[PDB]
Amino acid sequence: MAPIQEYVGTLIYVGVALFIGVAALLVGALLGPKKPGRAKLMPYESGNDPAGEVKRFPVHFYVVAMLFILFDVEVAFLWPYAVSAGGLGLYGFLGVLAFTLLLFVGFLYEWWKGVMR
């Protein structure tokens, strides 16, 4: 085990940080002049409309996102190995290499094919 106390201590901390956050925002929010909407409906640039209509966006963003998940799964697995690594011995290392090369093959496919397409 290890102290559950210190995980609690995180929760406390989160409660403090969130509080000071919200506190600042609520001061700011409540004070200020106002003139009701009738033209603050509009956003940046050229009056209304910031730039035309864009309807669709490239696959670029999908690809980048997708990479990150699969390789994040990699990292997840490589943490246990990082910790105990004199106990797992030489056989350990071979386990690691096998796994690594497999995800690296993944990599080489997406690299030789591209991250702008």
Binding site: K55, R56, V59, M66, I69, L70, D72, V73, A76, F77
Partner: protein, 95 residues
């Protein structure tokens, strides 16, 4: 015992999800909740029968993650030239 009961409830909710939703992306979203209902169960019993259910869970997560990737990839690739993202209106296979 409480937690393990809760997991079954969370499974129930997920089923309600899959049947109700009328958007493709939100079907898939619901599936992901079900997969976590599972992973919780798996840990819950892991306290009883010790240690292997942890490693179990980790592998499970990974499978889920993999299945996310391909599935969302597909959902995108199907509807990247129309935008009525309802999960019906695939009626064209039936005979």
């Amino acid at each position: 015992m409480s937690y393990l009961l809760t997991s079954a409830l969370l499974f129930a909710l997920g089923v309600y999800g899959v049947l109700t939703r009328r958007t493709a992306i939100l079907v898939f979203l619901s599936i992901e909740l079900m997969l976590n209902a599972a992973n919780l169960s798996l840990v819950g019993f892991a306290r009883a029968y010790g240690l292997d259910g942890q490693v179990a869970a980790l592998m499970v997560i990974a499978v889920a993650a993999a299945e996310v990737a391909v599935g969302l990839g597909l959902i995108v690739a199907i509807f990247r030239h129309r935008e009525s993202t309802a999960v019906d209106d695939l009626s064209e296979l039936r005979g």
